[PDB]
């Protein structure tokens, strides 16, 4: 399984990559940060993690919501654009590509902002390869595919953003932000596919096939919860693609997605994951915060593994995400309502 | 000359297999920010126990070494019973740090997760150990029939 | 023989290819070369009636400089993911990472251990250490420290790359100088201690190869 | 005589230990906590550590039993029909420590959460553990008739 | 005497134990992930485990039957011919098993959602036994013939 | 020589390999097109009926070729019959692979609509052709080794 | 003399079959997923699984010639044309096959949704055939010179 | 002497009839899509095609030149140049057709939107057969020099 | 004598031509590619496979001045400095061919965004493309030391 | 005799180790000039310092194949091969290390006009494993004897 | 007589080595070298630290190679093997982790002056690997000249 197999890379990128993970804040910190409310206390007990540096690099009197993003926002770079510089190989290449992945939907969000009067400054923390000043300028800024064609081919090495980009130039996944997203994020899983099919048979792993083919039904069902009572189309791509062709459908995610009362399915296929047939979007999030919080604390304790690095990246984000949830709450003078379910899983 | 072969290489399985079970059993107590209460208070046991597989190798290589002699019945050819009595006991002990390796992994990262399943971790890890003892054996067995 | 230069063709051959697989794509290993390789032995050591085996004749002393050869070559790699902890961690911390390098010096101890044995193991010949097949009988003795020479090359390449894996996670290992990092440097002296125990088992039990005549 | 044979006898452990170390490599992987402990799993899970272990068990007793017929000189009648016991214990040992590890694997993994599976978990490797037992019986057998050569 | 026939009798039961393994952890693996959502069809999809698992027994049988038959005396006329007739049983029992597990994994994640094709699955495990019935007769036919050499 | 034991039993080894491949690929087909409805679950076994045929002619061949055989081995009795059944054997075997694929490709499209039953069927009944030809070709090249000294 | 000439005629029918199932398989992979949304181009798909089908019968019958031209009695150079005419047709047949199943594939799909590309998909089906029949002449061309040697 | 220059004149026509395969299927893959887009650029497509399958008698060629020289007699040195004659007009023929069929599928795609793309494409097929015929007059002058007795 | 030293007389060709033809392959991709966008820069970019496929001439004069040189029986003299100088053309061609290749998918590709690096594009594959003279006046060496016996 | 694979191995590793090196130097010019169009000819100095190392390989090629005569012993043929591999390989290890030793010193120079100093350097020092080899093949050559 | 590859190993595994910790040490330093312009004259330290082990496997080519074609027999080709293998091997590691280690030590060094002194340390420090197997290699080609 692991640990048969020699990489020079992998150990340097994995200890680097543990490193920043035994450093960041805990559920106990969260909990403890999440009862408390105070803007004062907020930076003292926040000054003792890893985010303390850079909170405590520009701060002021009051607590304000910009600090909050440029904390996360300043330690996504160090976190992220600092090892793929150190690394090179395969792992590097996959590096590169996991941030491509988040990319191609990260640049369309971008891109889709870019008719709303929207530029690179005007866009919230997301996980990318590199910053906001070398390639989110020109890409954000840029319109025509032309330019993000020669933008993202500038880059090394290929990305996957040149199919999406070739695609929506002829105007062939739609015409609003939801269909796009949708599309990003089937052409998301099929390249973090074809790159988990790719460099699969390094190591031996399993609880990344299960986190990603969890990842992908609770995606299209995250997709088609979001979408109910939307009147979205069934002959529409916003059924992403999974491993199960038994269990989940591609009809009755189409069918559950229109707002219908078609919440049977997901009842269906639960008993095996913390989802479950409801009404509530609370529920169901805080239930998908759990579903996806499983078997990604075991990424952070085992070494010498290839998922430990996909889901070390997804848990800098979802605890980025629940660190500026906690501190945009605290931020306001009040209380979490949802946050404070999944502050913790 | 050829009966050298498999004394010399008896501890090579062996010694790889401790060199990857201790790696992999110390390359998995980084986290996860406890090192008073549990890294390392019942952890040790796979680090130090996937250094005795390198042992029976060695005793195995010393004691097949210095029972052969090339004034001895050495005209068969019958030393091809030393390289399957030295890769008996190195591909035991090779499985046996390559296992436990594994589940001193598992035990280290299964130990910090739940307070309750730490005796699971012990006592399924102790279970481990007793693999590579089949190749010292019958590598001791056949070194004790022959000559 | 034939097997004179197939056998440093085929021990550069491998090193080529083993070099090779970490670096650029130019060449690869054939994995094919395994199957082919044990299908024609036991197809000719199948069929016909006859005993398949091969001889050693008069060499018998390539593993005095793969000894070292493998000892430097082990200890050599193991440097550059315990150096490239400290450059990861960067400006994390003050703390131990810059001072934990105890650990590199018995890393540099493992280039020497079994040099020290491969420089020990010859003495007044460079052609060859005890009794060859090439003038005499008993090339049992010279013949053995190849095996040993290159088992103890093999433990110490190990032993190398143990303590640069246990160094490159015991460099401060948790986020910062506040927890010791000894617990990692325990699991990295319990990883280089095999260097010495399979150096002095492997010293011992390959006898004396030296004082040819 | 040839005197080919002897690594007959230590070629069984090989793959059935290698068999049991990764059906006792793969039963302690997985999820087997939640959120602070599990429905007494822990006490379950243990037996596919000795249900994997049973045929290394058996490897030795096998290997032992070819070592004390294989001798120091022996004719070469013997020495081909000696060989060739181990493989068999070897592959079948090999092949059920793998589906007990698969199969040790998913029934940990989906007996975490749910404790009834256990039943099923464990009858699943009860029932692959013959593999190592039923190429023993054949290495026995051929082990059995290897001995008083001419 | 030369020989080289003691290989074709371990050779035989190790296709069929690895095969009948991998078909009872693909079965155990799609039994375990069924049994967590619904705990009835939990003892109805355990019997293609213990049916899967009888494979081995005619290489088992054929194993015994063939090192029964063994001479004093090595020969061209007996050599050979057990390491085609187990080897033919051998990869009978590994197709079978490959086919069986492949048969019982997608039986069992597709009687997850809705059981309605558990008799089908078994009949497609008992219709592919067949096949492994079929090499089993050719290799006791051969291994009938495998005594009686000079 | 006498090694053509190994041959006689490659031709039932590789129509079983290629029959247990064809109804693998035949049942992963019906499993998820069973998980669709239920009322076409006995149209889709008919792939792996027609798949597991030709473990048949291996059989039979290995049969003939077995039943051929001299007491004395030598080169002239161990090299025709490796071919021979290796002939049947691989086109049993690309028949069955062939065949898996088609049972697949037709028991996935059967799933929606059921009036392609025919042609699947048809397609897929079309494949045995080269296992009748090499098993056809075993038997002539099975005809020539008999008087093996 | 070895008599091992047997290789080269079931050479020919193997790699005939296996490029002839290879084809037959990825036509009729996209003549199942073009006939599953319409069944009337069925019958115009149908041509590239007998075109694929049809080039087994140059590997049969250069098999069947090479097995009629072996005779009782055969020489150790008399296993070299039909290895090689043997080689070239199961290469030319499973080129022809390996571009049969590509062109019958895109053929299939790009014919389900316009009913146009008919007339260059039915061409280059029906001029990707030449292969089998140049390997198939080339066969015969060899197989010319092994009826006297012998 | 063994009498093995078959091999020569099989691997002409197995890499010419790859090649063509592989450029046929590649020029068939990319003419079905460009073939919905425009109409009239149906028989337009069908020149790469048949431009990819012309480099197929340079093997057959070669191979039906060389298997004449064979006959029931031969010797030591003859039966090395068709050897490399043949897997140099094969490997040229094999590298031409791979070149030939992405050539073709790209000047195919870069020819359904305009038409003025498509002189490059078959500039390119045009300029792509000169190693093919480099290898072929290669081949035919070693094949020339094989037969000077019998 | 032995007649093996037409692989090296067939090795400088095969390698010049499998170089020139993927050469010409990744030049006629990136060229087919771009040639859609703009249709002044055609002209342009065609430079690249006809500048690659003119380094075939240099293997094809080394091999039929080495063919010409070789009847039917020969020494082993020639058999070891022409397979040496057509395994230093050979590789020297395929070098030459895949920097030309890559060059010329480089500069095929770099021109449709900036009409500016024609300049440096053909004077990169005007110096990339000399490499073969070494390797053919190498094998003209050779050649003329490969005629002394025979 | 079989000391010709030697002569050609010398030429063949120097022609791969400089196609390698025009490879990366190609791949990076089109990049570097993609950016800004004011150099042209101030990225062909890694192309053209890589294919010095071609002449050290055909130099060495001709050398070695001049001394090829009608007669000649089989003891210069292992050490004319090792020397003319020491040289091929030395040669492919300065052209690899030029190929990106040429596209960091193009990349770096086009953004920072101070970097092609750095570049050139480094591409200028990086055939010292190519001329060692060669010195050593010109030895190992020189010490040739034992003919017939 | 095969010993004649030997002495082209060490150069050919020490020029691989250090050919691609060149190339690394390169692209470090030209990518270190476009965030600032002060850091050029401390990112080329593994550059130079890692091209210094060419000169090693150089002259134990040299001296392997001066032992070759004038006195040679069935037993003395064996040392000049497991010398330049020796060298070789430890020269093919040092410049494999010393790139590394430039390439880290360069972007530790990049954003503040406190790594470069561990970075220069490290590799410093290096050279003792290609040190103790230069010395096996030179005490194996003096302790030559034993059998005729």
């Not at chain 1, 790719?198 to 399993?206: D, F, S």
């Not at chain 2, 190798?57 to 030393?79: K, Q, R």
């Not at chain 2, 091809?80 to 589940?103: E, N, T």
């Not at chain 4, 009858?123 to 059995?144: H, M, P, Q, R, T």
């Amino acid at each position: 399984m692991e640990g048969v197999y020699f990489n020079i890379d992998n150990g340097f990128i994995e200890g680097v990559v543990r490193g920043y993970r035994n450093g960041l804040l805990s559920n106990n910190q969260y909990i403890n940060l999440t009862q408390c409310d105070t803007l004062e206390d907020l930076k003292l007990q926040l000054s003792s993690t890893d985010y303390g540096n850079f909170l405590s690099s520009v701060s002021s009197e009051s607590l304000t919501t910009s600090l909050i993003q440029e904390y996360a926002s300043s330690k996504l770079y160090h976190e992220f654009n600092y090892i793929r510089d150190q690394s090179s190989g395969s792992t590097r290449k996959f590096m590169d590509y996991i941030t491509y992945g988040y990319m191609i939907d990260n640049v369309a969000l971008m891109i889709t902002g870019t008719i709303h009067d929207r530029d690179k400054g005007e866009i919230l923390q997301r996980c990318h390869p590199l910053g906001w000043f070398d390639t989110l300028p020109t890409l954000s800024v840029a319109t025509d595919l032309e330019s993000l064609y020669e933008t993202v081919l500038v880059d090394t090495p290929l990305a996957p953003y040149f199919k999406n980009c070739f695609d929506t130039a002829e105007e062939l996944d739609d015409m609003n932000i939801e269909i796009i997203r949708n599309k990003l994020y089937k052409a998301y899983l099929e390249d973090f596919y074809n790159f988990v099919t790719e460099e699969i048979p390094e190591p031996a792993k399993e609880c990344m096939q299960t986190l990603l083919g969890f990842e992908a039904d609770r995606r299209s069902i995250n997709i088609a919860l979001n979408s109910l009572q939307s009147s979205d189309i069934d002959p529409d791509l916003k059924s992403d693609l999974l491993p199960n062709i038994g269990k989940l459908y591609p009809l009755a995610t189409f069918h559950l997605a229109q707002a219908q009362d078609f919440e049977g399915v997901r009842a269906a296929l639960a008993n095996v994951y913390e989802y479950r047939g409801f009404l509530e979007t609370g529920n169901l999030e805080d239930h998908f915060y759990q579903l996806e919080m499983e078997l990604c604390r075991d990424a952070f304790t085992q070494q010498f593994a290839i998922s430990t690095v996909w889901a070390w990246m997804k848990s800098k984000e979802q605890e980025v995400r629940n660190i500026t949830w906690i501190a945009e709450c605290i931020a306001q003078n009040q209380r979490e309502r949802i946050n404070n379910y999944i502050s913790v899983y | 000359f050829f009966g050298f072969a498999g004394c010399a290489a008896a501890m090579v399985l062996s010694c790889l297999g401790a060199a990857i079970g201790t790696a992999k059993s110390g390359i998995g107590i980084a986290g996860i920010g406890t090192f008073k209460p549990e890294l390392i208070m019942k952890s040790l046991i796979p680090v130090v126990m996937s250094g005795i597989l390198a042992i029976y190798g060695l005793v195995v290589a010393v004691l097949i070494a210095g029972n052969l002699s090339p004034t001895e019945d050495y005209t068969l050819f019958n030393g091809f019973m030393h390289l399957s009595c030295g890769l008996c006991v190195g591909f035991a002990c090779l499985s046996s740090g390559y296992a436990i390796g594994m589940v001193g992994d598992v035990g280290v990262r299964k130990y910090m997760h739940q307070p309750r399943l730490f005796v699971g971790i012990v006592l399924i890890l102790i279970f481990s150990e007793v693999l590579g003892l089949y190749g010292m054996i019958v590598a001791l067995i056949l070194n004790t029939r022959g000559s | 023989m034939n097997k004179e230069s197939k056998d440093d063709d085929m021990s550069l051959g491998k090193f080529s290819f083993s070099h090779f697989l970490y670096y650029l794509v130019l060449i690869v290993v054939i994995v094919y070369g395994l199957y082919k390789l044990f299908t024609g032995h036991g197809s000719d050591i199948n069929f016909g009636k006859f005993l398949l085996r091969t001889s050693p004749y008069m060499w018998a002393n390539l593993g005095i400089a793969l000894c070292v050869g493998l000892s430097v070559v082990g200890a050599a790699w193991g440097i550059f993911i315990t150096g490239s902890s400290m450059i990861g961690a960067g400006v994390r911390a003050p703390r131990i990472t810059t001072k934990n390098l105890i650990s590199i010096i018995f890393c540099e101890v493992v280039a020497i251990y079994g040099l020290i044995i491969a420089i020990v193991f010859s003495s007044k010949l460079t052609v060859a250490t005890a009794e060859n097949m090439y003038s005499k009988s008993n090339l049992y003795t010279g013949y053995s420290l190849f095996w040993a020479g290159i088992t103890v090359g093999a433990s110490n390449l190990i032993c190398g790359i143990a303590v640069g894996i246990t160094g490159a996670t015991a460099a401060i290992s948790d986020a910062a100088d506040s927890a010791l990092f000894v617990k990692i440097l325990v699991i990295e002296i319990f990883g280089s201690i095999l260097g010495l125990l399979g150096l002095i088992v492997g010293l011992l039990m390959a006898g004396k190869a030296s004082e040819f005549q | 005589a040839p005197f080919f044979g002897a690594i007959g006898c230590a070629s069984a452990i090989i793959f059935t230990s290698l068999g049991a170390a990764y059906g006792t490599a793969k039963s302690g992987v997985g999820i087997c906590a939640t959120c602070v402990l599990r429905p007494d799993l822990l006490f379950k899970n243990i037996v596919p550590v000795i249900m994997a272990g049973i045929i290394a068990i058996y490897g030795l007793v096998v290997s032992v039993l070819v070592c004390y017929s294989l001798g120091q000189k022996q004719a070469l009648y013997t020495g081909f029909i000696q060989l060739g016991a181990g493989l068999s214990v070897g592959l079948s040992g090999l092949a059920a420590g793998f589906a007990i590890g698969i199969v040790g694997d998913a029934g940990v993994r989906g007996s975490s959460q749910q404790p009834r599976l256990f039943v099923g978990m464990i009858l699943i490797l009860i029932f692959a553990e013959v593999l190592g037992l039923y190429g023993l019986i054949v290495a026995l057998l051929l082990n059995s008739r290897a001995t008083q050569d001419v």
